[PDB]
């Protein structure tokens, strides 16, 4: 029931994005909300036709890297992620993007212990998204049932943002 960007162009969605906003129903994320930081996420074509999403972010005086394989899931812009640690499966969709400024992503658990998880993410090409982009993200999060207290604009940073 999740919308996907019409005529999604995977070749234009590649490269460097910044995670500029987050909303979720995770008890963990809410507990850590104030401590959350902007991540740098690099998207590259994967060998399966989908995408590798490599993220780097500051956590407790260290730069952490995570890699997520997004496998094609039936339509362009619709992907599946399988957690290698828990086996949980998630649908991850590029809901709306203009490729050169922003993307709205929506992730929802499918099978396993993560099945109840839901999360919206604002990706931005710059670290300082304009008010109109932030209000766009707020609008999507509210339409999807996230409450004000679970929506956060992730504060920008020098840490872990370099190449």
Swiss-Prot record:
Result, substituting residue 123 to A: Increases enzyme activity about two-fold
One Gene Ontology biological process: prostanoid biosynthetic process
The keyword Isomerase is annotated on this UniProt entry: yes
GO cellular component, one term: endoplasmic reticulum membrane
Primary subcellular site in the record, as a coarse category: endoplasmic reticulum
UniProt catalytic activity: prostaglandin H2 = prostaglandin D2
Glycosylation sites: 3, 25, 52
Post-translational note: N- and O-glycosylated. Both N-glycosylation recognition sites are almost quantitatively occupied by N-glycans of the biantennary complex type, with a considerable proportion of structures bearing a bisecting GlcNAc. N-glycan at Asn-52: dHex1Hex5HexNAc4. Agalacto structure as well as sialylated and nonsialylated oligosaccharides bearing alpha2-3- and/or alpha2-6-linked NeuNAc are present.
Top-rank lineage group of the source organism: Eukaryota
Function comment: Catalyzes the conversion of PGH2 to PGD2, a prostaglandin involved in smooth muscle contraction/relaxation and a potent inhibitor of platelet aggregation. Involved in a variety of CNS functions, such as sedation, NREM sleep and PGE2-induced allodynia, and may have an anti-apoptotic role in oligodendrocytes. Binds small non-substrate lipophilic molecules, including biliverdin, bilirubin, retinal, retinoic acid and thyroid hormone, and may act as a scavenger for harmful hydrophobic molecules and as a secretory retinoid and thyroid hormone transporter.
Further remarks about this protein from its record: It has been proposed that the urinary and serum levels may provide a sensitive indicator of renal damage in diabetes mellitus and hypertension. Elevated levels in the coronary circulation may also be associated with angina. Changes in charge and molecular weight microheterogeneity, due to modification of the N-linked oligosaccharides, may be associated with neurodegenerative disease and multiple sclerosis. Detected in meningioma but not in other brain tumors and may be considered a specific cell marker for meningioma. Expression levels in amniotic fluid are altered in abnormal pregnancies.
Protein name in the entry: Prostaglandin-H2 D-isomerase
Species this chain originates from: Homo sapiens (Human)
């Amino acid at each position: 029931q999740v919308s996907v960007q019409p005529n999604f162009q995977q070749d234009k969605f590649l490269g460097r994005w910044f995670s500029a906003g987050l909303a979720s129903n995770s008890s963990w994320l809410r507990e850590k909300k104030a401590a959350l930081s902007m991540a740098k996420s690099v998207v590259a074509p994967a060998t399966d036709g989908g995408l590798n999403l490599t993220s780097t972010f500051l956590r407790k005086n260290q730069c952490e890297t995570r890699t997520m394989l997004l496998q094609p899931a039936g339509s362009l812009g619709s992907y599946s992620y399988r957690s290698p640690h828990f086996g949980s499966t998630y649908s991850v969709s590029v809901v709306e993007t203009d490729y050169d400024q922003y993307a709205l992503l929506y992730s929802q658990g499918s099978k396993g212990p993560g099945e109840d998880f839901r999360m919206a993410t604002l990706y931005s090409r710059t670290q300082t998204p304009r008010a109109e982009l932030k209000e766009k993200f707020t609008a999507f999060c509210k339409a999807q049932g996230f409450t004000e207290d679970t929506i956060v604009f992730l504060p920008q940073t020098d840490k872990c943002m370099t190449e």
